[PDB]
Amino acid sequence: SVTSKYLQSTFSKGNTSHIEDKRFIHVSSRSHITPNEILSLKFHVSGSSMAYSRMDGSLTVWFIKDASFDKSVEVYIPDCCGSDKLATDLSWNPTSLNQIAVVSNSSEISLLLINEKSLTASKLRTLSLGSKTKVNTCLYDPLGNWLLAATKSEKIYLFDVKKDHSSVCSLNISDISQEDNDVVYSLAWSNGGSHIFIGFKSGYLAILKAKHGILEVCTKIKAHTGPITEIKMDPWGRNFITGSIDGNCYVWNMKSLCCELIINDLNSAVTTLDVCHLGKILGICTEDEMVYFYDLNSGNLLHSKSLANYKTDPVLKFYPDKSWYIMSGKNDTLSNHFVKNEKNLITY
C-alpha cells in the first residue's frame, strides 16, 4: 500500500511543475487554437536529457539539471529535417552523450549532434537508401551496437553503428508477415541487442534474431485479434508486456513465451503504456481519455485518473533514473510529476 500512497502524493496540490515550452507560453498568452501534436518523446538512457517533436516541425530538447525545470537549458530549434518535412521518430544513441538519429517519413535519416554551450543543432551526417523507400522509425540497440530502420511496408534495415554505420543487412516485410497486407505498427529491442520484437497490424507478433548482423525469423505467435499498439520490456528482464487495440494488455513470460498475467478491468483500446525503471508499476493510457496505474506483480488496479477531454492524444513516460514521470497536460503541454523528497521508491 506504500505505492498507492506514493502515487496519490504524486497527484497532489504541490509536487507538480509545468514544463515551460513554446506551446506553454503560447497558450498562456492566447488564453489568459488547433493543437498541433506531440509526434514522439524519448529520454536519454542516463536520465539527464529529454527530446520530443511537435507537429509544427520543431524538436525541443532539455538538459535536465533541476526538478521543476528551473536551471534546465533548452535548445529550441526550427523545423529540422527539411522545411516541408517533419520529424516522426528519434533515437538517442546510447553510445555517446550527444548524438541523435531522427527520421522524417522520407528516405533520409539525419544524425545530428546537439550542443549545449550554444543553441546550435548541427547536422553531422545524412544516410540515404532506395529512392522509393519511405522509412519512419529508427531504434538503437540498448548497448549501442546496432541501429534499426523500418518502413510501413516492405523494408527493414539494420546498420552496424560501430563501423561508421555500414549497411549491415535488410529484409522484406512480406517475408516476415506472410499475410494479407500487413503494416508494422510498433517495434522494440530486447534488453541487450539480441532479438527484435515486431508487432504487425493483422495481429501477429514476430521475434527476429539479430545476433551477428544477419536477420532471421525465429518465431511468430498469433498474440492478439487487433493491431498491436505498443510493446514494452521489463527492466529486470523476466517478462515483456504487450498492449493492443482490442482492449487487452498481456504480460508474456520471457523464458517460456506463454501468457502469464492479463489486465481485465480494461474495456477500451490502448494508445500507449510504460513501466517504471523498477519494474513495479504499469501505466496504461486507454482511448477513452483515461489513465490507469496497475501493479505488475499482482495485477490489480491501484490508481485511476481521468484526462477529462484535455489533449485527446496523451503521452506517458517514466524516468529511466528516478520514479518520476512526464505526462501530458491540458492543451498539448507537458506536466512533470514528482514528490521532491523521494528520488526512488525504495527511499520511501
Partner 1 sequence: TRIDNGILAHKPRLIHKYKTHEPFESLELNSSYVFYYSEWNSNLTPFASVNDLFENSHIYLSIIGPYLGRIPTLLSKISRIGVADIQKNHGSESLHVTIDKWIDYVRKFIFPATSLLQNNPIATSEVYELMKFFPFEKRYFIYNEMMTKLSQDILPLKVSFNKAEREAKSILKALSID
Partner 2 sequence: TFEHLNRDTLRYINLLKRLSVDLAKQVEVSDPSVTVYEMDKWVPSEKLQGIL
Partner 3 sequence: SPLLDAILEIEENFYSKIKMNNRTRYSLEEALNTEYYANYDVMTPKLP
Q: Return the number of the residue (11 or 236) whose C-beta is nearest partner 2.
A: 236
Binding-site size, partner 2 (CB under 8 A): 4
Q: How many residues does the chain have?
A: 348
Q: How far is the CB of 192 from partner 2 (least distance, A)?
A: 7
Residue 302 contact among partner 2, partner 1, partner 3, none, beta carbon within 5 to 8 Å by kind: none
Interface residues toward partner 3, by CB under 8 A = 344, 346-347
Residue 70 phi/psi, 5-degree rounding, is: -75, -60
Identify the CA nearest to 265 among candidates 253, 282, 280. 282
Q: Return the number of the residue (213 or 237) whose C-beta is nearest partner 2.
A: 237
Q: Return the number of the residue (48 or 105) whose C-beta is nearest partner 1.
A: 48
Residue 237 contact among partner 2, partner 1, partner 3, none, beta carbon within 5 to 8 Å by kind: partner 2
Q: How far is the CB of 322 from partner 3 (least distance, A)?
A: 11
Q: Return the number of the residue (48 or 153) whose C-beta is nearest partner 3.
A: 48
Q: Return the number of the residue (60 or 244) whose C-beta is nearest partner 1.
A: 244
d(CA 78, CA 104): 14
- Does 192 engage in binding with partner 2 (CB under 8 A)? yes
Q: Which residues of 221-232 are buried (b: 16+ CB within 10 A; e: fewer)?
A: eebbeebbbbbb
Q: How far is the CB of 45 from partner 3 (least distance, A)?
A: 15
H/E stretch holding 114 reads strand 108-114
Alpha helices by DSSP H, listed for the chain, are 2-10, 22-31, 173-177
Residue 347 contact among partner 1, partner 3, partner 2, none, beta carbon within 5 to 8 Å by kind: partner 3
Task: Name every residue whose Cβ is closer than 8 Å to that of residue 11 and which is 6 or more positions away in sequence.
Answer: 303, 305, 337
DSSP string, 36-78: --EEEEEE-TTSS-EEEEESSS-EEEEE--SSSSSS-EE----
Q: Return the number of the residue (38 or 161) whose C-beta is nearest partner 2.
A: 161
CA distances from 316 to 2, 239, 335 (A): 22, 20, 10
d(CA 36, CA 23): 10
Q: How far is the CB of 347 from partner 3 (least distance, A)?
A: 7
Residue 94 contact among partner 3, partner 2, partner 1, none, beta carbon within 5 to 8 Å by kind: partner 1
Task: Name every residue whose Cβ is closer than 8 Å to that of residue 14 and which is 6 or more positions away in sequence.
Answer: 340
Residue 192 contact among partner 3, partner 2, partner 1, none, beta carbon within 5 to 8 Å by kind: partner 2
Identity of residue 164: D
Q: Return the number of the residue (153 or 191) whose C-beta is nearest partner 2.
A: 191
- Does 237 engage in binding with partner 2 (CB under 8 A)? yes
Q: How far is the CB of 319 from partner 1 (least distance, A)?
A: 13
Q: How far is the CB of 346 from partner 3 (least distance, A)?
A: 4
Quick check: helix, strand or coil at residue 248? coil
**Residues 347 and 6 sit within 8 Å (Cβ to Cβ):** no
d(CA 234, CA 249): 14
Q: Return the number of the residue (170 or 344) whose C-beta is nearest partner 3.
A: 344
Q: How far is the CB of 235 from partner 2 (least distance, A)?
A: 10
**Residues 60 and 69 sit within 8 Å (Cβ to Cβ):** no
Interface residues toward partner 1, by CB under 8 A = 45-46, 48, 94, 97, 222-223, 225, 236, 238, 248, 250, 256, 258-260, 262, 264, 278-280, 297, 321, 345-346
Q: In sequence order, what are the beta bridge partners of 147?
A: 140, 159
Q: How far is the CB of 6 from partner 2 (least distance, A)?
A: 25
Strand 239-244 versus strand 249-253 pairing type? antiparallel
Residues forming contacts to partner 2 in the complex (CB under 8 A) are 191-192, 236-237
